[model samples]
Target: NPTYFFTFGDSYSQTGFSASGTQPSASNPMGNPDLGIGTTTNGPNWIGYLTTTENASLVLSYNLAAGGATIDNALVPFYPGDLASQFRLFEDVYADKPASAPWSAEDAVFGVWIGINDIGNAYYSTDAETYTPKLISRLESLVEEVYKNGGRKFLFLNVPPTSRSPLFLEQGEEVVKQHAEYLSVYNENLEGMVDDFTKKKGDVTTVLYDSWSFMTKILDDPTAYGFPDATCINDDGTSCIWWDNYHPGMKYHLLQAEDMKPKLRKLGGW
Candidate 1:
């Protein structure tokens, strides 16, 4: 019962997918996964760790996450890897992929982990109360297109607390407070959108994974999750929480994937 998994996000999920067929793995000489195939982490992101190491029999994940993408085209300016473009690549290319094991809409599960960059860089900087809804609307429309194209199950991951990251930590206290506040509002509205949409469709099912809570628990006690409480700016992907200054260490990705495995299985009935 292997599922055809399609992940859409920013740096938190990419694994070096190229139209020219560049395989991403540690076994390959040039595209060494040990060095991270354009992922934000020191190790493979959640998508790579999930498919390659964790659940080969249960899910085949194709990550389409770009490093600096947001929900709207103009949100980040000149960034073509926005959510719309990401979906276009999937709908126009990957979904109809020429492969050994091709996938159909019924065989698909879309995992979307976006908005960290969205809120941080654009929407929240202005009239957040008004602008946030517009962003949410744009996101919903994209999801609707996927639904029409045969995608049934969808997984939504909320924005994690990047306020504590080394990158943001240096930004001072007020900036940190702003980041936390904006993140809180966005997740709430996003959850509300999911609930309302679920009731509206009644026939459709979606799950909003509370990433805020996930990160909170992990950051609350690093020892419980085998992660170092100390910052490892350059040389500690294994024990440290932050791989560099922004991305979660590979260990965190592995831990998140492990925690999320049974949840997805139960939700998707896999």
Candidate 2:
């Protein structure tokens, strides 16, 4: 049977997928704009690779992630189309499991990779500590919404090591140190929340991929991962791990997809 992949997140996971746009098919896996439009990675992000190339079978991807999306714009100052909006979009269009993309709880996998923008935009704010827990709670509620809609299998990626990115490297030591601590706190809370959610729901299978650790490992040994260095931003999106100071290049996205294959399989995602 074909698998249905439903994605939600910020730029790190967006594939520019919209019901109004071109749809996925055997001929064109991603659909719409050729290869890399509406993504921050300058190419297909991890979900794109997972749907098109790294899957064990045909994967019809419905990616609702948007660039700069936070869990909620009210919590963090992000543009519209936050995760909440995406959930509403899913409810409006895809919840019925239309014939064009008929998906069931058993056949569909929901993957979320947000929080980068939330932490990035909020770390410098005075309410960073207070808002962190609030953010996690809201994230839990959003996943619960999916659960209510019959989503049983899930993949959740934690916040990446943003302090290591070149964008933060230029901000001086104080900023770098603060950002890293916030990321650590976020990931820690996220892991705990995943465990608690599963225990509370009691019927869902969830996999939380440690994106921060994976990216850090690559940063520690760039050459082993086919990168020239960790800090260099490449325009072509291949020579370096980063496309810009804040986003990973396409190659790195592919690498992440490859690395996440087994985990997705564990959740019966593909």
Give per-residue CA lDDT, model 2, range 1-270, as digits (tens). Answer: 667778889888776787788876666666665556777777777877887778888787788888879998878868899999998898888888888778888888888988999899888774555678899999999888888888898889999898988999999989999999887888888898999998988988899999888899999999998887899998677899888888998899998889899888866645
lDDT of 1 by residue, 1-270 (tens): 556677888888876666446533223312323335567666677777666655635565566778778987765543778888899887777655447336565556788998888877863456667777777888888888877776777889999988778888798878888888877888888888888777887666577888789888988887787765735554456768887888887778878877777667634423
lDDT of 2 at 19: 75
- How do all models score by TM-score? 0.87, 0.95
Model 1 C-alpha RMSD to native = 3.4
lDDT for 167 (candidate 2) = 91
Identify the runs in model 1 with alpha carbons over 4 angstroms from their true place: 22-36, 76-78, 95-101, 267-270
- After the best TM-score superposition of candidate 2, give how far the Cα of residue 93 lies from its true spot, in angstroms: 0.6
**Which whole-number lDDT from 0 to 100 does residue 173 have in model 2?**
84
Worst 10 residues of 2 by lDDT: 26-35
The model with the greatest lDDT is: 2
